[PDB]
Symmetry: C3
Subunit: 223 residues, 3 copies
């Protein structure tokens, strides 16, 4: 009963953690979760039950927060559009999300990803595509397109110099600032276009639904 | 000849390192060691030859040492039994072990595992089972049951607050103490029951015997 | 056009990064690069385009630099030869290399590898062979034998005490110096002999050639 006050909605940014499918196609269709997915759902259960946050956040994520405004401005000038940070979190019965930029005029979501350094930044188009696949940003965009009724998403990978306050004793000013400022700004944005894929949105639904059932079972053990 | 003063007995806590079997069933039956097993046996050889200890020990293992008495008391009250720390190391021709608790009245070994934090602690029954499998504690218990002539083992995963002296500059008091003290103690013990499995004990024998032959070969190279 | 001032030659020490072959034999023969190889070539492209050095160097590599002379002396006394550090970097159309020791009298390259500690040092012959395979030193030697017209290479893995200036606050004087000085020096050199393999040299050619084409494509995206 207490456990009807616990209910899982998966953040769009965490959907890649639970989206994976069993290698067995019959188990995929039966809605069995992968070991990775279960491990992620346990972290979500332990956060909601105990307040323990597995991923605190660090200099990488703090850089994106500090440069968020600058990223959105670059997204805008690259497209000749006056863009603003979206400030609403939406949700449906499965997921919740707060996108960076919503452009209703083009049925378009834009998301800015502020790379840490030249090494991690995907300058090259194959590199950007893979990074979006490996990091799960493709699935994240499908979640935003679902919540915002959009037809496309564009992930703007952007490299700015690292703000001084985030460069630790062991980090390099030369690498994280000087070398970056030498590169023309137009070469430091790489965009990956993701088309809405309703079969993928249906997959998000199936996987999240299986995750919520597993989550409920976890909650019941602690009740 | 000098090398007849080197002889491998594998600690119960390290048996998981050498227990793995080749994917090839014919090689398993021929007693071939896996690459993992060989790598572990080299560490054992280099410790006995050179005094170099690969695994020093750290805040995680120090927590278990500091809270060992408290763990055993919780193991006892959970069962209505007055339990004491076992203080003998036993050995046979293959392995050596010192269990935490021996209950001859029930042909039972108990082992306490003091989790570091909420994240690493297996609250959930599937989680505890997997942790015992992944960490090799199931095989460790088979080794103690062999040495102590017991029919069952119970692994008590227990979460206590982290002692202040073990919380580094970068660790969280809030997470490692405050959040833990909010959780009822009865929800911070999860027990996994392992039945004695004589086929597994025979596997320990085979694998350790192959390890000892490999070890002897390593010793001979340095002689 | 600017991009005709960018040209990839792979260092012998990095050849293992790009030498891997697709699991598909038809793709291997078509000259397709593995994902690992592509990832390495991107790091090379970003270094030449932006000056960003992915691998800076650390206490492990600094130890080898400091003890380079001592290593070469041990290589020499082990063989009864007066050896000197080779000081030329050679190159051909594919690779560049600077070997440690060239012995034209024996059509022989020697390379010294200064292990960090007892744990990482390959005392055992199987261990040394695997380390040379895992680290890619076998392929590195094929590259030097190609550049220096030699028939064989010998990799001398050598363990000396770690110089004091490289032992960090958290490192052990006892382990990195005292325990090492107790071991006879003749037990702290393990040599692996690599025969010239012209089929492997042809493989280096094919793989580097595919890498250079991929590299050129990366350069063109940034031009
Ligand atoms: Cl989100
Ligand atoms: Cl990044
Ligand atoms: Cl033990
Ligand atoms: Cl733990
Ligand atoms: Cl080189
Ligand atoms: Cl090393
Ligand atoms: Na973003
Ligand atoms: Na224990
Ligand atoms: Na060398």
């Amino acid at each position: 009963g207490m456990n009807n006050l616990y209910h899982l909605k998966v953040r769009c940014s965490s959907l890649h953690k639970i989206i994976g499918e069993p290698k067995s196609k019959a188990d995929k269709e039966a809605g069995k979760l992968t070991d990775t997915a279960k491990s992620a759902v346990r972290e979500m259960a332990k956060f909601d039950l105990f307040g323990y946050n597995a991923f605190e956040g660090n200099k990488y994520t703090q850089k994106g927060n500090e440069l968020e405004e600058q990223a959105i401005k670059l997204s805008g000038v690259t497209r000749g559009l006056a863009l603003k940070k979206n400030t609403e979190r939406r949700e449906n019965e499965f997921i919740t999300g707060e996108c960076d930029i919503y452009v209703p005029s083009r049925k378009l979501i834009i998301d800015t990803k502020c790379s840490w350094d030249i090494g991690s930044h995907p300058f090259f188009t194959d590199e950007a595509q893979e990074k979006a696949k490996k990091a799960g940003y493709d699935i994240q965009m499908q979640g935003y397109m679902w919540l915002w009724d959009c037809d496309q998403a564009q992930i703007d990978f952007v490299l700015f110099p690292t703000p001084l306050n985030l460069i630790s004793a062991y980090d390099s000013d030369f690498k994280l600032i000087d070398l970056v400022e030498q590169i023309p700004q137009i070469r430091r944005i790489t965009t990956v276009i993701i088309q809405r894929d309703n079969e993928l949105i249906d997959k998000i639904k199936e996987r999240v639904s299986a995750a919520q059932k597993y989550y409920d079972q976890l909650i019941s053990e602690m009740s």
